[PDB]
Amino acid sequence: VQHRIRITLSSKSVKNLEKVCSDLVKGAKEKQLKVKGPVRMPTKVLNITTRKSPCGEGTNTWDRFEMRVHKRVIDLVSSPDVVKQITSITIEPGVEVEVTISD
């Protein structure tokens, strides 16, 4: 009856992601789901080094950019009709949600 569903969630912003995950989590606790998370996953740090000159003279000075991508997952023991009963509330900016039906 009660299936096993997973929620895959990632963003660019610490605060904003932490707000979205807690929203889903307290949603789950209001409906007394068997919920397990939010497990935190190591942050993937895209980096670039670029010679900040546009012509190539002067002191060789580079600049480093870094996009951090923060990975989070939650496990829910529910039916997908309950999943769409829950996960329709506001989603805060920039955060991304890709629910997956697992084994």
Binding site: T49, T59, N60, T61, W62
Partner: protein
């Protein structure tokens, strides 16, 4: 796990010392543990306390954390 070779020796020393003092403090006695800490900290202090020193990032304009490319005027 991890580290190098001598780094692992220096972790083993630390973890033996720190597990000894934790085990005595929780299961033998505080006062009886005091003699152990005072012997160890008498020999040295780095048995018990980690070393804050790490490898610090290398800055552009020279291979080396604190070095630079060789400089030529002519």
């Amino acid at each position: 796990r991890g580290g190098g070779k001598t780094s692992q020796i220096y972790s083993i020393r630390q973890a033996i010392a720190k597990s000894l003092v934790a085990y005595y403090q929780k299961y033998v006695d505080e006062a009886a543990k005091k003699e152990v800490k005072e012997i160890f900290a008498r020999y040295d202090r780095t048995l018990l306390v980690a070393d804050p020193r790490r490898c610090e990032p290398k800055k552009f304009g020279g291979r080396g954390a604190r070095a630079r490319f060789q400089k030529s005027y002519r």
